[PDB]
């Protein structure tokens, strides 16, 4: 009957520090989840959970409000599970991403910042009328059902 698609942007910035920290952290980085352009995903996003590498203290980082982001320093890239939880009461209650937080991009001088963007399109089949309105308030659109 109804299919709603909405877009999320997942990304990160990393840059070599001008001097490593006392712990040996060589890079500063920031990972985020956000709407495209003008789109406010807080209409349908309850919270975003970033699962950091267990070298980091309290590695389950939660943002219940924008900005959905984590900013840290470190010495190596790692795989970061990210959960985007929705303001809905039916499945899917969340979407699980596995984000590659890398500190080096070949072709980029390490002194220069790196920026990576991942554009993810979410598809919701037969959402509740409430959730449909939240999705559309966040830039979602209805498309050919299924």
């Amino acid at each position: 009957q109804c299919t709603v698609q909405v877009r999320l942007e997942l990304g990160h910035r990393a840059q070599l520090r001008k001097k490593p920290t006392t712990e040996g952290f060589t890079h500063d980085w920031m990972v985020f989840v956000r709407g495209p352009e003008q789109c406010d995903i807080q209409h349908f996003v309850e919270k975003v959970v970033f699962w950091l590498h267990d070298s980091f203290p309290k590695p389950r980082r939660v943002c219940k409000e924008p900005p959905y982001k984590v900013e840290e320093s470190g010495y190596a890239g790692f795989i970061m599970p990210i959960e985007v939880h929705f303001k809905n009461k039916e499945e899917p209650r969340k979407v699980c991403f596995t984000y590659d937080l890398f500190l080096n991009l070949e072709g980029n001088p390490p002194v220069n910042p790196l920026n990576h963007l991942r554009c993810e399109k979410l598809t919701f089949n037969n959402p509740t009328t409430e959730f449909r309105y939240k999705l559309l308030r966040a830039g979602g659109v209805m498309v050919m059902p299924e």
């Binding site: 070298s55 190596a76 890239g77 790692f78 890398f102 500190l103 080096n104």
Partner: peptide
């Protein structure tokens, strides 16, 4: 690259 350095990965963990």
């Amino acid at each position: 690259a350095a990965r963990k």
